Design a protein around this ligand. Structure first.
Ligand code: BR
Ligand code: CL
Ligand code: ZN
Length: 585
């Protein structure tokens, strides 16, 4: 019964209405508005695509609310003016939804600019802010900073009367200062040992339009100003951020107290750090721009869009996050570890098909054209709810080129050779080599065998029959096999730069693979959900029309799903992950 929500960091969280206040009477309205129910928020900046790390923030905030029958905001933190970029907003919405969560309301930090400005005047009127005209360097010097440790002291602006500050702030608003010539600073404590109390900048002059508020504003608040005040206005009961910002909790609470508003409870958890890839917008941008990957959703990347297109089930991500647990400590996870978790999840949940990447035609010389041995095969052993299907064994079929070898002295090779018969999955007898045919280039184009129907074979291989009756094979136009994008676990530390740690074989494309005809029924009945998952607390209902929900295990090959670009006419598969953890090879 124990999950991340009732133990560790989330388990130790306060109850609604039991977090400390500077002013006692403010809790009353808080409880009235919240109704004593949990209110969290997911407040991403809509200036980029979300990556795997954000899955933890999503699950933590939406999950905690859900667990307590409360609500979670989806708040676009658009505090800073930016160029229009709708794609980021919609992607964020899709990813939240993809992971199975629902915002009770969607808001923007910019929705509160009017109230934020008012509170800024309140802060000034309470003698807790001043208008400063110091340059960036003069501000650094006042903070004892090009190395730190120096003496700290106030500028002359800090002593300004309330009247002067208020007038100058209104002049900032009305465009009487150029950008940088004036800022509103919080009047905190320059003698404090904490940098977050060194008179933080609250408002800047930017003279730039805003997508939501147009040309209305010449001045904008900073994150230091907006985050706690918006949390307060939205009556957040649990403001959950990463420990990366633990130091700012002091100034977070200070600001609320200075303008006499409800003081929300900011509590910090350790973020998820994925190593073995690159997550910065600038570096991924380089990969995309220079064509190292196909785009921002390329399956080799660890953006959430990429992970979705790759075929990683959303429930696997949720389960993974829960297993790691949530505490004040960061979770530092290798790509290999994440991929192992996905692999195990897929092994528990996927239907199993016979699929041949690089097919070689096999002809059975001693079987008639009307011979048909119907092999009925469960979609997944030990999973009755997945049912079964049938595959016709005829006198013509395809096997993997890698499942035949002419080298009869290779004691490690357990498949088909001229001196060694091979078994076929769910087929009664083995097949034995008779002859082969090559083209001028020496490539094998056909193998003749006998069906040994009148000593056990070393292994049983997959096969795809040629059978017009059952429209077999299903022909796959393109199969994209993905390996590690980088050769090392720390690409950014590569001498010649991270781009030089790229793995040349990160994407291997196979053309004209062949698949058993029952793939059609697999597609039709996707997603395939085992009972254990259906009844778990991490079940995510997926869109049955999404391509990526068509996940399956290709026996002896790996785990695959349909790519975004796939169609019935031109089937395109992505390999989600290989069958097994790495070997020395
Ligand atoms: Br955060
Ligand atoms: Cl490649
Ligand atoms: Zn100053």
């Amino acid at each position: 019964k124990r999950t991340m929500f009732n133990e560790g960091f989330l388990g130790d969280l306060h109850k609604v209405g039991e977090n400390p206040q500077a002013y006692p009477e403010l809790m009353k309205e808080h409880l009235e508005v919240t109704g004593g129910k949990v209110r969290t928020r997911f407040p991403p900046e809509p200036n980029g695509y979300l990556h795997i790390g954000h899955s933890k923030a999503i699950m933590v905030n939406f999950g905690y609310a859900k667990y307590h029958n409360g609500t979670c905001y989806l708040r676009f933190d658009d505090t800073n003016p930016e160029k229009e970029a709708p794609e980021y907003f919609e992607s964020i919405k899709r990813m939240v939804s993809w992971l199975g969560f629902k915002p009770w309301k969607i808001t923007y930090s910019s929705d509160y600019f009017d109230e934020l400005y008012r509170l800024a005047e309140v802060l000034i009127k309470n003698g807790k802010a001043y208008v400063c005209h110091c340059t960036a360097e003069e501000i650094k010097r006042g903070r004892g900073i090009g190395t730190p440790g120096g003496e700290r002291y106030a500028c002359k602006h800090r002593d300004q009367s309330i009247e002067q500050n208020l007038q100058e702030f209104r002049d900032m608003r009305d465009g009487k200062y150029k950008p940088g010539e004036a800022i509103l600073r919080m009047k905190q404590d320059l003698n404090s040992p904490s940098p977050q109390m060194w008179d933080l900048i609250a408002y800047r002059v930017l003279n730039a339009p805003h997508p939501r508020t147009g040309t209305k504003w010449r001045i904008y608040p900073t994150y230091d100003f907006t985050h706690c005040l918006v949390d307060s206005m939205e009556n957040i009961t649990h403001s959950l951020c990463t420990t990366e910002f633990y130091l700012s909790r002091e100034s977070y609470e200070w600001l609320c107290d200075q303008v006499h508003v409800f003081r929300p409870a900011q509590r910090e958890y350790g973020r998820l750090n994925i190593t073995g890839t690159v997550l910065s917008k600038r570096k991924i941008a380089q990969l995309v721009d220079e064509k190292f990957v196909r785009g921002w959703d390329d399956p080799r990347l660890f953006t959430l869009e990429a992970i979705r297109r790759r075929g990683v089930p959303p429930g696997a991500i949720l389960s993974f996050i829960n297993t790691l647990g949530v505490t004040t400590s960061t979770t530092n996870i290798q790509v290999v570890r994440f991929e192992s978790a996905v692999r195990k999840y897929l092994e528990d949940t996927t239907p199993r098909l016979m699929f041949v990447l690089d097919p070689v035609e096999v002809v059975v010389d001693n079987l008639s054209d009307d011979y048909e041995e119907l092999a009925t095969i469960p979609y997944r052993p030990g999973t009755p709810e997945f049912g079964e299907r049938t595959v016709p064994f005829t006198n013509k079929f395809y096997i993997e080129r890698s499942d035949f070898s002419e080298n009869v002295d290779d004691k490690e090779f357990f498949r088909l050779t001229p001196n060694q018969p091979v078994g076929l999955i769910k087929v009664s007898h083995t097949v034995s080599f008779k002859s082969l045919e090559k083209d001028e280039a020496g490539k094998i184009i056909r193998i003749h065998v006998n069906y040994d129907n009148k000593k056990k074979p070393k292994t049983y291989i997959q096969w795809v029959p040629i059978s017009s009756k059952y429209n077999s094979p299903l022909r796959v136009t393109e199969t994209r096999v993905y390996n590690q994008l980088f050769k090392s676990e720390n690409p950014s530390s590569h001498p010649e730069g991270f781009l030089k740690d790229i793995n040349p074989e990160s994407e291997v494309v196979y053309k004209e693979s062949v698949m058993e005809h029952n793939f059609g029924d697999v597609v039709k009945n996707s997603p395939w959900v085992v009972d254990s998952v259906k009844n778990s607390e991490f079940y995510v209902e997926e869109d049955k029309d999404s391509k990526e929900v068509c996940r399956f295990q290709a026996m002896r090959v790996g785990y695959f799903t349909l790519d975004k670009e796939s169609t019935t006419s031109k089937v395109i598969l992505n390999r989600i992950v290989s069958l097994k953890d790495a070997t020395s090879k």
